[PDB]
Write a protein that binds this ligand. Structure first.
Ligand code: CLA
Ligand code: CLA
Ligand code: CLA
Ligand code: CLA
Ligand code: CLA
Ligand code: CLA
Ligand code: CLA
Ligand code: KC2
Ligand SMILES: CC1=C(C#C/C(C)=C/C=C/C(C)=C/C=C/C=C(C)/C=C/C=C(\C)C#CC2=C(C)C[C@@H](O)CC2(C)C)C(C)(C)C[C@H](O)C1
Ligand SMILES: CC1=C(C#C/C(C)=C/C=C/C(C)=C/C=C/C=C(C)/C=C/C=C(\C)C#CC2=C(C)C[C@@H](O)CC2(C)C)C(C)(C)C[C@H](O)C1
Ligand SMILES: CC1=C(C#C/C(C)=C/C=C/C(C)=C/C=C/C=C(C)/C=C/C=C(C)/C=C/C2=C(C)CCCC2(C)C)C(C)(C)C[C@H](O)C1
Lengths: 60, 180, 175, 94, 90
C-alpha cells in the first residue's frame, strides 16, 4: 500500500476487522508490523490507531 | 413423406423399418424414438389379438362357455366373466389367469426396453421368438413391414369393432353381415 | 439512455431490446437485483399458465365435456366440484411437465433462450425472422392473459357466472 | 366482553389487520426517516455532533419524505443500497 | 482424539457432483436406472392400491394389503435411486 490510502483490515482479532482505515505511515525497517492505520471508530479501549502487516491490509 | 404439406421430422430415422414419414404433428421430437417404436410394435401385437378374438368369438366358442357368457357379447364377455369371478365361482377365473401371465411376461421383458434405450445390441421389437424359423429365417421377405401394416390396421379395426356393439347389440360377424 | 415506456425515467440496464417483449418498463429495479433470464423465464411461465387459464374460463361456457356436463359453468364452483383424486391426476400431469423445467433451470440455466423446453413439434420458428414475431407475440399475449385472468377471477367472485354468461346478463356493477 | 377475531377473515379485519396496516405504515415511516438521517449525519463535519445536536431543518426535510417509504425503501433495496454485503461488516473471530 | 471406528466396508460417500456415486445405494449399486424407475412406478401403484383397499380400517384387515401398503414410501426411495442411477449413466 502507500501512505494515505484507504485499506480494509484482515486481522481477525482486530476491533476493525473488515473495516476501513487510512494508512498514516509505513516503516521501512525490519519491523514486524510496519503499516500504521488510523480509524474513525475508537476501539473498546478508546484507541483509534494500530499497527498491522501487509497480508492483513488490502486497498479498497 | 406421406403428406408433402407437413414435413417428416428429422429425428425419425429414414433407415428404421416401417417408416413412411407420416408424422404431421411431429410427435417424434417430444419422446424417445426407440421407446416410441417399441410402444408401437407392442400396441400392434395386442390389437391384432383383440380383433381376431372379436371375429373368432362369434364364429366359435369353447365348450361350456355358453352358460357362463351371454350368447353374443364382446366387452360384455369380460364383464360377465368378472361378475362370476367376483361372485366366487371357481370356473370363471379366466381374467385373472390372462392378467397374471401377461403381467409376468411384461415383468420379465422389462429390462429389454431400457437396455435398448442405452444402446444395447438387441434392436427394438426383436425378442428372437421364431421357433418355426420359416417366417424370419435367412434373408426373410416383406413380412417385417407386413406385421406393421397389419398391426396398424388391427389398431383402428379394434377401435371400430369395440365402438360398434357399444351403441348396438350386434357383434362383429353380425354387424358385417347385416348393416342398418 | 431513457426508457421507451416511461420517457422521463431512465432505461434499466439489465433489460435490453433483444428480449422479446421489451418496452423499457421497469420502474422498480427487479432486474437490477434478480437475474434477467430468471425473470424472463418466470414471466413466460406465468403467462403460459394464465393463457391456458384465461381460455379455461371461457371454454366450458360454449361446450362442456360430456362427462362433466353436469358441472357448473361458473369456474369457482367447478373448482370445488372436481374430486380430490381428479386434482391429484392434474397435479401429477403438471409435475411431469415441470420436471423438464426443473432440469432446464438449475442444471442448464445459462444456455438456451428463456422459456424454451424444446416443445416445437410443428417445427415452427425454425427460421430466425419468423421466430422473432412468434416470441414477441407469446410474451405479449401472456401479459394480457395475466391481467385478463386476474380480472375474470375477481369478477367471477362478484357475479357467480362464467365470463360469457356475465356478458349475457350484464351484471357488471357492484349492486 | 368483546372478543377480537384475528385469524385473517375479512369480516373482522378492523380489529387487527387494518390497525396493523396503519401501524406498519407509521413504523416504516419512522424507520425510513431515522435511517435517512443517520446516513446524512455520517457525511457531516462531526458526525457524532449531528446526533446529539440535531440539524432540525434537515431532519424535517427527512420526516416529510417518509410518506412513500414502501416504494423508496424497496427501490433502495433493489438498487443495492439498503443491504450491505457480508464482507463489509465487522464480525467476531469465532 | 482417538481413531473413531466404523464397520468394515465403510467407504467414502461425500459427493459434490450432480448425483452421488452409486455406492450410496448399498446393495442396489448395480441396478439400472430403468429398473429403479419401473420398480418406482410399480411400488407406487401397488402400494397405493393396497393402501386404498384398507383405508376404512377394520379389526380384520387383510395382512397382504397392510404389507403391500408399505410399498408407497418405498417407491419414493426407488425414484430417488432412479435419478441417481440415470445421472451416473446406469
Ligand atoms: C386381447 C385379446 C383377447 C382377450 C382379452 C380375450 C378375452 C376372452 N376371450 Mg377371446 N380370443 C382372442 C383374444 C382375446 N380374448 C383370440 C386371439 C382368439 C383366437 C382367434 C380368441 C378366441 C376366443 C374364443 C373362441 C373364446 C374366447 C373367449 C374369451 C373369454 C374367456 C377366455 C378364453 O377362453 O379365451 C380363449 C382365447 C384363446 C384360446 C385365444 C388364445 C390365443 C393366443 C393368445 C395366441 C398366442 C399365439 C402365440 C403363440 C403367443 C406368443 C407368446 C409371446 C407373446 C411370448 C375372455 C373374455 C371365450 C368366450 O367366452 O367367448 C364368448 C371363447 O369361447 N376367445
Ligand atoms: C380351452 C378352452 C376350453 C375348453 C376346451 C373347455 C371345455 C369344456 N368346458 Mg368350458 N370354459 C372355458 C374354456 C374351455 N372349456 C372358459 C374359458 C370358461 C369360462 C371361464 C368355461 C366355462 C365352462 C363352464 C361354466 C362349464 C364348462 C364345461 C366344459 C366341459 C363340458 C362342455 C359342456 O358344457 O358341454 C368341456 C370339457 C362344463 C364342465 O365343467 O363340465 C364338467 C361347465 O359346466 N366350461
Ligand atoms: C398378422 C399378424 C402378424 C404378423 C405378420 C407378425 C409378423 C412378425 N412378428 Mg409378430 N405378433 C403378432 C402378429 C403378427 N406378427 C401377434 C398377434 C403377437 C402376439 C401373440 C406377436 C408377437 C410377436 C413376438 C413376441 C415376436 C414377433 C415377431 C415377428 C416377426 C418374425 C416371426 C414371423 O415371421 O412371424 C410370422 C407370423 C405370422 C405369419 C402370423 C400368422 C398368423 C396366422 C397365419 C393368422 C392369424 C391367426 C389368428 C389366430 C386368427 C385366425 C383367424 C380368426 C379371425 C378366426 C414377424 C415380423 C418376432 C420378431 O420380430 O423377432 C424375430 C418376435 O420376437 N411377433
Ligand atoms: C390452467 C388451465 C385450466 C384449468 C385449471 C382448468 C380446470 C378445469 N376445467 Mg378447463 N379448460 C382449459 C384450461 C383449464 N381448465 C382450456 C385451455 C380448455 C380448452 C380446451 C378447457 C376446457 C374445458 C372444458 C371443455 C371443460 C373444462 C373443465 C374443467 C374442470 C375439470 C377438469 C378438466 O376437464 O379440465 C379440462 C382442461 C383441459 C382439457 C386443458 C388441458 C390443457 C393442457 C394442460 C395443455 C395442452 C397444451 C397443448 C394442447 C399441447 C398440444 C401438443 C401438440 C403436439 C398437439 C376444471 C375446473 C370441465 C368442467 O367441469 O367444466 C366446468 C369441462 O367440461 N375445461
Ligand atoms: C393415465 C391414464 C388415466 C387413467 C387410467 C384415468 C382413470 C380415471 N380418471 Mg383420470 N386423468 C388422466 C388420466 C387417466 N385417468 C389425465 C391425463 C388427466 C388430466 C391431467 C386426468 C384427470 C382426471 C380428473 C379430473 C378426474 C379423473 C377421474 C378418473 C376416474 C374415473 C372415475 C372412476 O372410475 O372412479 C378413473 C379412475 C375422475 C375421478 O377420479 O373421480 C372419482 C376425475 O374427476 N381423471
Ligand atoms: C396460523 C397460521 C395462519 C396464517 C398465516 C393465516 C393467514 C391468513 N389467513 Mg387465516 N386462519 C387460520 C390460520 C392462519 N391464517 C386458522 C387456523 C383459521 C381457522 C380455520 C383461519 C381462518 C381464516 C379465514 C376464515 C380467513 C383467513 C384468511 C387469511 C389470509 C388473510 C390475510 C391477507 O390479507 O391475505 C390475503 C390478501 C392478500 C394477499 C392481499 C390483500 C390486500 C392470510 C393468508 C382470509 C383469506 O383471505 O383467506 C385466504 C379469510 O377469509 N383465515
Ligand atoms: C430509526 C433508527 C433505527 C432503525 C432503522 C433501527 C432498525 C433496527 N433495529 Mg434498532 N435501535 C435504535 C434505532 C433504530 N433501529 C435505537 C435508538 C435503539 C436503542 C433503544 C435501538 C435498539 C435496538 C435493539 C435493542 C434491537 C434493534 C433491532 C433493530 C432491527 C429490527 C427492528 C426493531 O427491532 O426495532 C426495534 C427498535 C427498538 C427496540 C428501539 C427503537 C426506538 C425508536 C423508536 C427508534 C429511534 C428513533 C430515532 C430517534 C429516529 C429519529 C429520526 C430523526 C432524527 C429524523 C432493525 C435493524 C433489533 C435487531 O437487531 O433485530 C434484527 C434489536 O434486537 N434496535
Ligand atoms: C370412434 C371410433 C370408431 C372407429 C375406429 C370406427 C372404424 C370403423 C371402421 C374401421 C375399421 C369401419 C369399416 C367402420 C364402419 C362403420 N362405422 Mg365406424 N368406427 C368408429 C365409431 C362409429 C360410430 C360411433 C358409428 C359408426 C358407424 C359405422 C357404420 C354404419 C352402419 C350403420 O349405418 O348402421 C359402418 C359401416 C355407425 C353405426 O354403428 O351405426 C349404428 C355409428 O354409430 N362408427 N367403422
Ligand atoms: C408372431 C408369430 C406367431 C403368431 C401369432 C398370432 C396370434 C398372429 C395373429 C395375428 C392377428 C390375430 C391378426 C388380426 C388382425 C385383425 C384385423 C386387421 C381386424 C380389423 C377389423 C376391422 C377392419 C373391422 C370391422 C367391422 C366389422 C367386421 C364388425 C362391426 O361391429 C364393426 C366394424 C364395422 C368396424 C406364430 C404363432 C405364427 C409363430 C411365429 O414364429 C411368430
Ligand atoms: C406451444 C405450441 C402450440 C400451442 C398452443 C396453445 C394452445 C396456446 C394457447 C394460447 C391461449 C390459450 C391464449 C389465451 C389468452 C387469453 C386472453 C388474452 C384473455 C384475456 C381476458 C381479458 C382481457 C378479460 C376480461 C373480462 C374483465 C376483466 C371483466 C369481466 O366482467 C368480463 C371480461 C371477460 C371481459 C402448438 C400446440 C400449436 C404446437 C406448436 O408447435 C407449439
Ligand atoms: C372391457 C372393458 C372396456 C373397454 C374397452 C376398449 C377395448 C376400448 C378401446 C377403445 C379405442 C381403441 C378407442 C379409439 C377410437 C378411435 C379410433 C381407433 C380412430 C382411429 C383413426 C384415426 C384417429 C384417423 C386416422 C386417419 C384416416 C381417417 C386416414 C388419414 C390418415 C389418418 C389421419 C391417420 C369398457 C370401456 C367397455 C368398460 C368395461 O367395463 C371394461
Amino acid at each position: 500500500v502507500k501512505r494515505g490510502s484507504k485499506v480494509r483490515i484482515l486481522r481477525k482479532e482486530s476491533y476493525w476487522y473488515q473495516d476501513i482505515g487510512t494508512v498514516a505511515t509505513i516503516d521501512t525497517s525490519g519491523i514486524r508490523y510496519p503499516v500504521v492505520v488510523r480509524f474513525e471508530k475508537v476501539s473498546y479501549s478508546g484507541v483509534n490507531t494500530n499497527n498491522f502487516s501487509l497480508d492483513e491490509v488490502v486497498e479498497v | 413423406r406421406a403428406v408433402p404439406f407437413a414435413p417428416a421430422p428429422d429425428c425419425l430415422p429414414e433407415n428404421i423399418p416401417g417408416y413412411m414419414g407420416f408424422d404431421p404433428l411431429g410427435l417424434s421430437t417430444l419422446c424417445n424414438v426407440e421407446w416410441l417404436r417399441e410402444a408401437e410394435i407392442k400396441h400392434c401385437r395386442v390389437a391384432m389379438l383383440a380383433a381376431a378374438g372379436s371375429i373368432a368369438q362369434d364364429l366359435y366358442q369353447f365348450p361350456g362357455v355358453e352358460k357362463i357368457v351371454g350368447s353374443a357379447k364382446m366387452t360384455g364377455v369380460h364383464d360377465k366373466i368378472l361378475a362370476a369371478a367376483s361372485t366366487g365361482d371357481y370356473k370363471a377365473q379366466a381374467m385373472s389367469q390372462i392378467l397374471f401371465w401377461t403381467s409376468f411376461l411384461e415383468i420379465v421383458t422389462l429390462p429389454a426396453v431400457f437396455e435398448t434405450m442405452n444402446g444395447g445390441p438387441r434392436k427394438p421389437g426383436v425378442f428372437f421368438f421364431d421357433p418355426l424359423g420359416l417366417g424370419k429365417g435367412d434373408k426373410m421377405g416383406e413380412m417385417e413391414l407386413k406385421e406393421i401394416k397389419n398391426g396398424r390396421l388391427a389398431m383402428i379395426g379394434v377401435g371400430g369393432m369395440v365402438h360398434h356393439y357399444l351403441l348396438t347389440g350386434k357383434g362383429p360377424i353380425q354387424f358385417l353381415s347385416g348393416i342398418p | 439512455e431513457m426508457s421507451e415506456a416511461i420517457p422521463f425515467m431512465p432505461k434499466p440496464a439489465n433489460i435490453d431490446s433483444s428480449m422479446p417483449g421489451y418496452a423499457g418498463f421497469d420502474p422498480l429495479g427487479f432486474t437490477d437485483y434478480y437475474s434477467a433470464k430468471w425473470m424472463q423465464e418466470a414471466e413466460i411461465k406465468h403467462g403460459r399458465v394464465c393463457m391456458l387459464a384465461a381460455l379455461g374460463m371461457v371454454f366450458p361456457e360454449f361446450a362442456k365435456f360430456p362427462q362433466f356436463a353436469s358441472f357448473s359453468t361458473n369456474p369457482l364452483e367447478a373448482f370445488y366440484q372436481v374430486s380430490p383424486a381428479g386434482w391429484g391426476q392434474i397435479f401429477l400431469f403438471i409435475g411431469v411437465l415441470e420436471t423438464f423445467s426443473y432440469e432446464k433451470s438449475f442444471y442448464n440455466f445459462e444456455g438456451g433462450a428463456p422459456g424454451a423446453l424444446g416443445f416445437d413439434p410443428l417445427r415452427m420458428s425454425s427460421n430466425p425472422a419468423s421466430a422473432k414475431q412468434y416470441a414477441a407475440a407469446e410474451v405479449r399475449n401472456g401479459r394480457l392473459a395475466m391481467i385478463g385472468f386476474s380480472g375474470m377471477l375477481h369478477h367471477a367472485i362478484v357475479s357467480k357466472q362464467g365470463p360469457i354468461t356475465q356478458i349475457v346478463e350484464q351484471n357488471f356493477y357492484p349492486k | 366482553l368483546p372478543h377480537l377475531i384475528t385469524d385473517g377473515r375479512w369480516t373482522h379485519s378492523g380489529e387487527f389487520v387494518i390497525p396493523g396496516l396503519l401501524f406498519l405504515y407509521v413504523a416504516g415511516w419512522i424507520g425510513w426517516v431515522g435511517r435517512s438521517y443517520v446516513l446524512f449525519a455520517r457525511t457531516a463535519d462531526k458526525p457524532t455532533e449531528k446526533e446529539i445536536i440535531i440539524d432540525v431543518p434537515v431532519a424535517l426535510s427527512f420526516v416529510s419524505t417518509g410518506f412513500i417509504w414502501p416504494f423508496s425503501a424497496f427501490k433502495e433495496f433493489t438498487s443495492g443500497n439498503l443491504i450491505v454485503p457480508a464482507d463489509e461488516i465487522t464480525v467476531s473471530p469465532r | 482424539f482417538s481413531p473413531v471406528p466404523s464397520p468394515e466396508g465403510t467407504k467414502e460417500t461425500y459427493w459434490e457432483t450432480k448425483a452421488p456415486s452409486s455406492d450410496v445405494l448399498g446393495i442396489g449399486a448395480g441396478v439400472s436406472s430403468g429398473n429403479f424407475a419401473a420398480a418406482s412406478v410399480f411400488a407406487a401403484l401397488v402400494g397405493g392400491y393396497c393402501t386404498g383397499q384398507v383405508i376404512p380400517l377394520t379389526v380384520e384387515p387383510n395382512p397382504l394389503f397392510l404389507a403391500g401398503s408399505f410399498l408407497l414410501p418405498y417407491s419414493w426411495a426407488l425414484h430417488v435411486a432412479a435419478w441417481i442411477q440415470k445421472n451416473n449413466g446406469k
